[PDB]
Amino acid sequence: GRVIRGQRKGAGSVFRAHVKHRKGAARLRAVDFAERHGYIKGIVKDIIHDPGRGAPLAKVVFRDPYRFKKRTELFIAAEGIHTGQFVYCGKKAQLNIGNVLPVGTMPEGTIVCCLEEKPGDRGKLARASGNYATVISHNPETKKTRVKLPSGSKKVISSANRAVVGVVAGGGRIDKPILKAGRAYHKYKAKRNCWPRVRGVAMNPVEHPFGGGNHQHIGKPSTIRRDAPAGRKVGLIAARRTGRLRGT
RNA sequence: CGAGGGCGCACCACCGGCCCGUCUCGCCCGCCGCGCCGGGGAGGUGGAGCACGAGCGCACGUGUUAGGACCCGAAAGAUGGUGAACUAUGCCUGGGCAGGGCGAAGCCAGAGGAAACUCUGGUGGAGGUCCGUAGCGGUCCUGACGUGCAAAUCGGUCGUCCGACCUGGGUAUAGGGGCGAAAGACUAAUCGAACCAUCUAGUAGCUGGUUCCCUCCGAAGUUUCCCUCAGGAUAGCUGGC
RNA sequence: UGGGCCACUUUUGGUAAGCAGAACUGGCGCUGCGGGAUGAACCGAACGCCGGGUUAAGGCGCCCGAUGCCGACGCUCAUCA
RNA sequence: CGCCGCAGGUGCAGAUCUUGGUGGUAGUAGCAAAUAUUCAAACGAGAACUUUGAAGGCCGAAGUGGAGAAGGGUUCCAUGUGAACAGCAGUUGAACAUGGGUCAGUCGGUCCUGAGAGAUGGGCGAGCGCCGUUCCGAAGGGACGGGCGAUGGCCUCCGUU
RNA sequence: CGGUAACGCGACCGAUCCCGGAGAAGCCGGCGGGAGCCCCGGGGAGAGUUCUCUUUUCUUUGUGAAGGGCAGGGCGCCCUGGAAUGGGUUCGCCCCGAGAGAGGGGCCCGUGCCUUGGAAAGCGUCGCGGUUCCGGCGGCGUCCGGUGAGCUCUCGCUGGCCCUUGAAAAUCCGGGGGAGAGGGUGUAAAUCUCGCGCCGGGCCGUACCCAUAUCCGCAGCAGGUCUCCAAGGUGAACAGCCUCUGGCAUGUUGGAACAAUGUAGGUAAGGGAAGUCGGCAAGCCGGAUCCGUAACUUCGGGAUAAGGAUUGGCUCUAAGGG
RNA sequence: CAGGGGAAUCCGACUGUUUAAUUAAAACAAAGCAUCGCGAAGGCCCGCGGCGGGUGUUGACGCGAUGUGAUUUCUGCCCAGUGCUCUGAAUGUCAAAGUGAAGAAAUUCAAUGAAGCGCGGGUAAACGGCGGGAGUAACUAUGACUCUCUUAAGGUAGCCAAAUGCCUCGUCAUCUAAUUAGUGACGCGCAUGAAGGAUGAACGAGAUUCCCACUGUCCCUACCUACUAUCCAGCGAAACCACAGCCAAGGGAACGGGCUUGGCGGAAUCAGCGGGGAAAGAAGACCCUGUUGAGCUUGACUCUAGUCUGGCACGGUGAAG
RNA sequence: AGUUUGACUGGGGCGGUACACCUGUCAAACGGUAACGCAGGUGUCCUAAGGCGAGCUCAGGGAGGACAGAAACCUCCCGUGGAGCAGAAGGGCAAAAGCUCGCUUGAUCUUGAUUUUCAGUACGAAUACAGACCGUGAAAGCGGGGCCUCACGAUCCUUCUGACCUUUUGGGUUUUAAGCAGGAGGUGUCAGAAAAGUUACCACAGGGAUAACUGGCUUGUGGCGGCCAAGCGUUCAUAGCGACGUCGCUUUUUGAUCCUUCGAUGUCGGCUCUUCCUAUCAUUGUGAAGCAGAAUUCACCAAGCGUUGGAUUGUUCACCCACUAAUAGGGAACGUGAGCUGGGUUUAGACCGUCGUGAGACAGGUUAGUUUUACCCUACUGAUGAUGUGUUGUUGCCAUGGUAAUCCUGCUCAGUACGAGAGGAACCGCAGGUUCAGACAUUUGGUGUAUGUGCUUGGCUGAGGAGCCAAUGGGGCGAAGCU
Ligand SMILES: [K+]
Ligand SMILES: [K+]
Ligand SMILES: [K+]
Ligand SMILES: [K+]
Ligand SMILES: [K+]
Ligand SMILES: [K+]
Ligand SMILES: [K+]
Ligand SMILES: [K+]
Ligand SMILES: [K+]
Ligand SMILES: [K+]
Ligand SMILES: [K+]
Ligand SMILES: [K+]
Ligand SMILES: [K+]
Ligand SMILES: [K+]
Ligand SMILES: [K+]
Ligand SMILES: [K+]
Ligand SMILES: [K+]
Ligand SMILES: [K+]
Ligand SMILES: [K+]
Ligand SMILES: [K+]
Ligand SMILES: [K+]
Ligand SMILES: [K+]
Ligand SMILES: [K+]
Ligand SMILES: [K+]
Ligand SMILES: [K+]
Ligand SMILES: [K+]
Ligand SMILES: [Mg+2]
Ligand SMILES: [Mg+2]
Ligand SMILES: [Mg+2]
Ligand SMILES: [Mg+2]
Ligand SMILES: [Mg+2]
Ligand SMILES: [Mg+2]
Ligand SMILES: [Mg+2]
Ligand SMILES: [Mg+2]
Ligand SMILES: [Mg+2]
Ligand SMILES: [Mg+2]
Ligand SMILES: [Mg+2]
Ligand SMILES: [Mg+2]
Ligand SMILES: [Mg+2]
Ligand SMILES: [Mg+2]
Ligand SMILES: [Mg+2]
Ligand SMILES: [Mg+2]
Ligand SMILES: [Mg+2]
Ligand SMILES: [Mg+2]
Ligand SMILES: [Mg+2]
Ligand SMILES: [Mg+2]
Ligand SMILES: [Mg+2]
Ligand SMILES: [Mg+2]
Ligand SMILES: [Mg+2]
Ligand SMILES: [Mg+2]
Ligand SMILES: [Mg+2]
Ligand SMILES: [Mg+2]
Ligand SMILES: [Mg+2]
Ligand SMILES: [Mg+2]
Ligand SMILES: [Mg+2]
Ligand SMILES: [Mg+2]
Ligand SMILES: [Mg+2]
Ligand SMILES: [Mg+2]
Ligand SMILES: [Mg+2]
Ligand SMILES: [Mg+2]
Ligand SMILES: [Mg+2]
Ligand SMILES: [Mg+2]
Ligand SMILES: [Mg+2]
Ligand SMILES: [Mg+2]
Ligand SMILES: [Mg+2]
Ligand SMILES: [Mg+2]
Ligand SMILES: [Mg+2]
Ligand SMILES: [Mg+2]
Ligand SMILES: [Mg+2]
Ligand SMILES: [Mg+2]
Ligand SMILES: [Mg+2]
Ligand SMILES: [Mg+2]
Ligand SMILES: [Mg+2]
Ligand SMILES: [Mg+2]
Ligand SMILES: [Mg+2]
Ligand SMILES: [Mg+2]
Ligand SMILES: [Mg+2]
Ligand SMILES: [Mg+2]
Ligand SMILES: [Mg+2]
Ligand SMILES: [Mg+2]
Ligand SMILES: [Mg+2]
Ligand SMILES: [Mg+2]
Ligand SMILES: [Mg+2]
Ligand SMILES: [Mg+2]
Ligand SMILES: [Mg+2]
Ligand SMILES: [Mg+2]
Ligand SMILES: [Mg+2]
Ligand SMILES: [Mg+2]
Ligand SMILES: [Mg+2]
Ligand SMILES: [Mg+2]
Ligand SMILES: [Mg+2]
Ligand SMILES: [Mg+2]
Ligand SMILES: [Mg+2]
Ligand SMILES: [Mg+2]
Ligand SMILES: [Mg+2]
Ligand SMILES: [Mg+2]
Ligand SMILES: [Mg+2]
Ligand SMILES: [Mg+2]
Ligand SMILES: [Mg+2]
Ligand SMILES: [Mg+2]
Ligand SMILES: [Mg+2]
Ligand SMILES: [Mg+2]
Ligand SMILES: [Mg+2]
Ligand SMILES: [Mg+2]
Ligand SMILES: [Mg+2]
Ligand SMILES: [Mg+2]
Ligand SMILES: [Mg+2]
Ligand SMILES: [Mg+2]
Ligand SMILES: [Mg+2]
Ligand SMILES: [Mg+2]
Ligand SMILES: [Mg+2]
Ligand SMILES: [Mg+2]
Ligand SMILES: [Mg+2]
Ligand SMILES: [Mg+2]
Ligand SMILES: [Mg+2]
Ligand SMILES: [Mg+2]
Ligand SMILES: [Mg+2]
Ligand SMILES: [Mg+2]
Ligand SMILES: [Mg+2]
Ligand SMILES: [Mg+2]
Ligand SMILES: [Mg+2]
Ligand SMILES: [Mg+2]
Ligand SMILES: [Mg+2]
Ligand SMILES: [Mg+2]
Ligand SMILES: [Mg+2]
Ligand SMILES: [Mg+2]
């Protein structure tokens, strides 16, 4: 009879992202004339740590092509780039780690960093540390490119979508065991209020569908249908299978 | 005074008769409309009817009922508001935490090794590390107290004491909502749904109460029906006229 | 009012019950009074306020009104009458 | 106030009834957490408690010391009173009465932004309004620079418009 | 305008615009500098003890801000030069042909010292006048040293930790660039972040308590309520115990007694958990030094395992430095 | 100032957290392990409403939803049931709208056929589940073995009178003089068992047993100290109170202070005391009744936000059919 | 989100339906008459098992007859029904009401009256008529269902049937709809709501109309006795027992009941402490024996005195160890919680097993879980006093009340009596002990703040000396007093 946890997360109040010390939105530069027809050279000025993100951010300074000013970008750092390096963004940029260039003008096996989901926005795909997307096949007609996402899914996107060449830095961060509950506390203190997770079976029936009982048991199939209302769909949501994944 | 006789009020029992409905039987009658027209009879039966009216208005009493409804009494439900000065959690900005024990990596030297490397002594100072202050907490005495110092305190003994640590202030989340390392915990001594006002004199077959005198009469706890079994309706028993 | 209960007798269940359930009349409930020491229901008797007389059931050693009869005939001794 | 009529918010022992008052309990329970007081004097009607002096102790710098924030709001300071109050007392008081006291360019506020709050545009909404905070806005009212002029005047020439 | 340079000098033309800096950054460790305090040896001044001793014990014995100069600390600053037989160097580290060691310079901080302030003030003493109750007047003094893993602040250097990387904005400044402006050789112009001079700074708060009596808890309530400073002895120590500065009157009463029962605290022959649901409660142990430590183990631990010895006072003797 | 120690069993790995005011724990959390959803026109969630809002200054080494609970070692069989999910296959049922027919129309009938449900696959680290009866070896006793009935599969590795075993104080051994306790062993286990089983150091104000030491826990009590209590001066409540207050028996609403019969009864008081006053505290919380509730659950009845799907409108321009 | 989650009931739940009906009985010779009284039955069945008429006689038995037998069919005789009539039971029935045939649809259309239940309401069922239309029989007649007693259902709604019926809203026609009358679709909780759980997180109004704990009645059950004496006891009923039967007592078992208490009588066990009972374990005095002694057993007077220390268990119980003269049984609100304790049960946290889809449940296990108040009256314990002898004092008496001692061992008797032997007492006497009681401090022990005297740590008074502080600083020894 009480609003469950997870339902309370959408209201935002306490479950909002801890963005006080974050360094800004990590994005490619907005597509313009120089990047659409040639290349623009920028210099990597600093590589910084973004709180709540396990991927380094690269501060890249460009020249404004229309007024006497310096533009500062906050690229997602591909592994191997260093401060003082020159990065080149545009259609005519060559294949090097850190350069930003459209996927349609790339070989058939190149693997990219900060992929655009739509032709014009900033990077949206393969942004988490150690991740990348592979270019599978182009087709000169209808301006389409097929890419492999970190999840293994295949996606068809426009050939005009831009991406950084290489793999985002941060490597195998998940390989290290956290070991200590406190280390997980510090990890999630810089992210949001989500970490100390109470099991639903340990709750009372009023605050969870799995709550209650003289033994801690679910009492009903944990797999729940897709169209179940909020406050009910807990457990394995719309699960195609359960068990152990033996075979793939 | 009077055997007998007569007219007989009201009222009662009965038998006839009349009006409307409905059945059964059957034969006649009427005409500006001759009709799928209209009317009439006899015999049963249904009616809160007729059969030389008794009503209307006003007052008083009793009884039943709807209303706050003889008086006081819920657990609840709804509407609209006020609270995060306590606590719960997130964020912002500050402040704080004796003295010791153990002795991780890294480093130096010596020694033994063909190599691979090994041994010894120092150095170093790691850790949700140990003993233990302040702080924070609250195990046991099931101690004190228990109309207390106190609507949760006190004594000793205890857990932890560089961390998921303690804490001020500023902020955010508000009631079927919040918040919860989860005890249905906490949300201003109130929480298995806060507080305030109103709907509201909420309802109660249940509990408690129900105020002067004398005189006369005087019970029932049984019948039948009831989601009836602590209650009603009904007949019975009572009183009054 | 629609909770009844009790007694003689009849009577069902139960080992039985100051239990449970019927029949009949009376009673208590609603009822005081005399007697049963005491007691809702037993026995007598039902009640305005009194005087006198007499009784009912029950009593008459003393408490405590009445045998303080020269009462009648027997029975009985109990170191739990 | 009686009598004839009229009309009631018309009669109390109860309701763990309402309000007010008063008993027994009873001069009883009690005035027992943190070692501790004593001598002399003064004022005074009055001294275990006030003041001074002397002595003995305690807090023992993580104080029973010296200063602040929050909160309180005159409790601060003198003089006086001695009704009540300070659960004994008081000649004392944070009591009562009468007066007095808080002085800033340089200590804070003020200014900045933080987590956040919140108009306007817009959107929604029966509506009070609330959503949203850059989003669906013609969102810059400013500037030493230059020009056209007014010469406003110590019209040389610099300030104005 | 000067210096090879780091950079220096008192100013040192310059707008729109652009770039950068400061503001502006966690926690912890180890060292080093400075100060305040503490300590020790003398010199004064005033007190205390003097039964005997004590050249004794106690108190006290200043120099603000802001300038100038000098120490001291730091530098990931410059010049010469070119290093293996590698060398410098820290407690640890760490550093070097991307320029070590060495020599010579530059800069930053300078809260330390001296100086102006400054002794005239303050303080300590000894007197003298009175102005009911003079910032009265006067004399003398306010001195020399030494120590430190000492405590507290502060500054600096160098490390460690993070799947944690520890604000923003007002505000101020430097630079780049050079649109412009300035004057015709004058006792000159534009201009000036140099020295001195002139004027102004409004508004609100400001007393006191800050707690076993000024706040909340119905109260002068053993509760609660955020901070700063922090002496001597013992000791590992912000422990406990005693003391100095400062504070107080025993916590909303006193007096007399010393029954039971209690609350709090001790002791108890012999036995030693037989008590009790149960060793509850109490008791035993305990610091430091020297030994000595098992099973098991995730090899880290267990571990102060367990067990044993010693511990005072006094007189010395060695060793550890500048 | 200032650790009693040792040998074991159970549980939780540890540090951490928790019912302010009776439960600090074995409960919660945790790292680790496993599963599920989602590529943004998205997953999950808020929102009366706006193409509103949170995750999100995010992008699969990420967010969201679950279970289990360090390490070690393992995690067996069952997709019949209920869930979940997957492609629709000639395909069954299936609303509104639309189509056709009859009628004078209301209307009636028929054809067509969205999701869903049926049909078919997958899935147990989803919920859950994991059998009986007979005969049989050259002493007996068991039963390696053999027959059948039946399931979706018939409990595997392990573990055990365990915090899980009724019978039960199970049986045997050890610990004691004596043990419903402990430990070790056995196992047809009423009713053990695999994301949880079985272990294993360190740790624990966790539950249990024994041993050394220690003692007033006890035999068996005594003495002392402080503050009370006590008495006094001052000050000064409250709870409670039908009236009250000595007993035995009787009867009685079946346990009297009062009534009957008897025993008896002597002012006013002080310190104690805990037998009575069925003492006080509260309109019993247990239990039942009420056509009185509330918290919670669910194929109870009746609904509903949200969601999936069809139709109409916004809603247009061209071709292949 | 809202709501519901029946009733009865020897408490509720579970179980049953005694909730609507029918038969016999209860039931006490009219009728009626109750309990979760007894024995049973019903929610149907039947175009015939309905209606007429006719003709037969049934169950069973005896005697006969090829296969044929205990039963196949045929025949005769007896046959009061001992068969059958659908079913439960009861009643009724013989040229019946049964069996077999023939013809049929009175199981049809109608209005009233009445009986049964009863309020003299309804439904259902039934009785007697009356009016039609029929069936059957020669006819009288009989028949509107079943031989009789049961076999069933309101309003609202729906559906069908009937009247050349009424209305359909200004008139008319036609659909439609509404109506009038009669059937049907059903309410079995059967006079007729539409309805699942859980709560230990719980709430309210009540209930002693009603359970759990005391008391009360009862005494089946438990416990303890008695009568008879078939037997046991080598033999011998009765030393000691006591079958089959039968009579009691007790209230320390457990039931039965529900009278008191639900505006509350604190709910197990232990601890502590007092008193009471006797149905006597021991001890005193006795009787009996299958009593030689020793030991043991039975019984009497008898409750004065005693009846213990421990291991496991919360236990009450139980069991074992050991001592003992003996280790008897019980009551007092299952004595005793303002006496304690809190181990158990019995709140809220939590784990396991089983059950349940789930919430949650479990006389299943486990772990943690606030035990409040006396100063009132009485009772009791002690302490002053009070009334009467004029005041006051000393010394006394005793009414009345209380009451207290207990048990064992060793030596001697005595290796005696007795006995084959083994073994093996007693009376007097002596020495001591146990439990209890009343005191006491010479001794020993304990206490010790004489704060008495040494020692000693830290600090403090300038040192010495003398002291003090550290809530009794610590420690050794310690008078007196208490013990
Ligand atoms: K809700
Ligand atoms: K589970
Ligand atoms: K009325
Ligand atoms: K309000
Ligand atoms: K609410
Ligand atoms: K009833
Ligand atoms: K009535
Ligand atoms: K820290
Ligand atoms: K303040
Ligand atoms: K005294
Ligand atoms: K013990
Ligand atoms: K810790
Ligand atoms: K704990
Ligand atoms: K799972
Ligand atoms: K399955
Ligand atoms: K399945
Ligand atoms: K613990
Ligand atoms: K509730
Ligand atoms: K009869
Ligand atoms: K009914
Ligand atoms: K009996
Ligand atoms: K009984
Ligand atoms: K009872
Ligand atoms: K009760
Ligand atoms: K006991
Ligand atoms: K002594
Ligand atoms: Mg969790
Ligand atoms: Mg829980
Ligand atoms: Mg739920
Ligand atoms: Mg659950
Ligand atoms: Mg679990
Ligand atoms: Mg007539
Ligand atoms: Mg009337
Ligand atoms: Mg409601
Ligand atoms: Mg606030
Ligand atoms: Mg707050
Ligand atoms: Mg630690
Ligand atoms: Mg620790
Ligand atoms: Mg405590
Ligand atoms: Mg206590
Ligand atoms: Mg009222
Ligand atoms: Mg009301
Ligand atoms: Mg009904
Ligand atoms: Mg009543
Ligand atoms: Mg009644
Ligand atoms: Mg009745
Ligand atoms: Mg009766
Ligand atoms: Mg009555
Ligand atoms: Mg009468
Ligand atoms: Mg009478
Ligand atoms: Mg009488
Ligand atoms: Mg009598
Ligand atoms: Mg008499
Ligand atoms: Mg007489
Ligand atoms: Mg009135
Ligand atoms: Mg009155
Ligand atoms: Mg007193
Ligand atoms: Mg006192
Ligand atoms: Mg002191
Ligand atoms: Mg202070
Ligand atoms: Mg003052
Ligand atoms: Mg006073
Ligand atoms: Mg005042
Ligand atoms: Mg100076
Ligand atoms: Mg050099
Ligand atoms: Mg001077
Ligand atoms: Mg320049
Ligand atoms: Mg001030
Ligand atoms: Mg206070
Ligand atoms: Mg207040
Ligand atoms: Mg004191
Ligand atoms: Mg005092
Ligand atoms: Mg005070
Ligand atoms: Mg002793
Ligand atoms: Mg001893
Ligand atoms: Mg014991
Ligand atoms: Mg014992
Ligand atoms: Mg202890
Ligand atoms: Mg060990
Ligand atoms: Mg733990
Ligand atoms: Mg584990
Ligand atoms: Mg806590
Ligand atoms: Mg608590
Ligand atoms: Mg606790
Ligand atoms: Mg694991
Ligand atoms: Mg997890
Ligand atoms: Mg499978
Ligand atoms: Mg097995
Ligand atoms: Mg087992
Ligand atoms: Mg075992
Ligand atoms: Mg034991
Ligand atoms: Mg499995
Ligand atoms: Mg009595
Ligand atoms: Mg009484
Ligand atoms: Mg009540
Ligand atoms: Mg109540
Ligand atoms: Mg009812
Ligand atoms: Mg409800
Ligand atoms: Mg359903
Ligand atoms: Mg019922
Ligand atoms: Mg009769
Ligand atoms: Mg009869
Ligand atoms: Mg015939
Ligand atoms: Mg009925
Ligand atoms: Mg709970
Ligand atoms: Mg009763
Ligand atoms: Mg014989
Ligand atoms: Mg009572
Ligand atoms: Mg009581
Ligand atoms: Mg009582
Ligand atoms: Mg006897
Ligand atoms: Mg008892
Ligand atoms: Mg108690
Ligand atoms: Mg008692
Ligand atoms: Mg317990
Ligand atoms: Mg519990
Ligand atoms: Mg067990
Ligand atoms: Mg506890
Ligand atoms: Mg007193
Ligand atoms: Mg006598
Ligand atoms: Mg005696
Ligand atoms: Mg000393
Ligand atoms: Mg000396
Ligand atoms: Mg002192
Ligand atoms: Mg002290
Ligand atoms: Mg001694």
Shape: elongated
Radius of gyration: 23 Å
What is the tally of beta strands?
Answer: 12
Oligomer: part of a larger assembly
Count of helix runs = 2
Largest sheet: 4 strands, antiparallel
Bound molecules: potassium ion, magnesium ion
Widest sheet: strand order?
A: 3-2-1-4
Into which percentage range does the β-strand content fall? 15-25%
**What structural class results from the helix and strand content?**
mainly beta
SSE topology sketch:
Elements: H1 33-37, E1 39-48, E2 57-63, E3 70-76, E4 86-90, E5 100-102, E6 111-112, E7 133-139, E8 144-148, E9 154-158, E10 162-164, H2 181-189, E11 223-224, E12 236-237
The protein binds six RNA strands through α2, β11 and β12.
PDB class: ribosome
Keywords: Ribosome, In situ
Entry title: In situ human 80S ribosome (composite map)
Fold and architecture overview:
Its main location: cytoplasm. Belongs to the universal ribosomal protein uL2 family. This is part of a larger assembly, with one chain. The two termini are 41 Å apart. The strands form four sheets. The chain has a four-stranded antiparallel beta sheet with strand order 3-2-1-4. Strands 6-7-8-9 form a four-stranded antiparallel beta sheet, with no helix packed on it. The chain is built from two helices and twelve strands, in the order H-E-E-E-E-E-E-E-E-E-E-H-E-E. The protein is mainly β and 248 residues long. It has helices at 33-37, 181-189; strands at residues 39-48, 57-63, 70-76, 86-90, 100-102, 111-112, 133-139, 144-148, 154-158, 162-164, 223-224, 236-237. The longest helix has 9 residues, at 181-189. The structure holds six RNA strands.
